[PDB]
């Protein structure tokens, strides 16, 4: 019942509520209620990244 997404691109956080990811990272999806920005967990950090830059795996 987990929810994982694949990072399709690098993304560097540009705001306090964003988080950085590297292409190929496997992120835990926390909140996908917004169509443009998804909240994800990238290890010990959480924050928003662009929804289009990740892909649901499950």
UniProtKB/Swiss-Prot annotation:
Residues represented out of the complete protein: 968 to 1025 of 2477
Family to which this protein belongs: Belongs to the spectrin family.
Domain of life: Eukaryota
Location of this chain's protein in the cell: Cytoplasm, Cytoskeleton; Cytoplasm, Cell cortex
Organism this protein belongs to: Gallus gallus
Entry function: Morphologically, spectrin-like proteins appear to be related to spectrin, showing a flexible rod-like structure. They can bind actin but seem to differ in their calmodulin-binding activity. In nonerythroid tissues, spectrins, in association with some other proteins, may play an important role in membrane organization.
Name this polypeptide is given: Spectrin alpha chain, non-erythrocytic 1
Quaternary organization: Like erythrocyte spectrin, the spectrin-like proteins are capable of forming dimers which can further associate to tetramers. Interacts with ACP1.
Location of the SH3 domain: 1-58
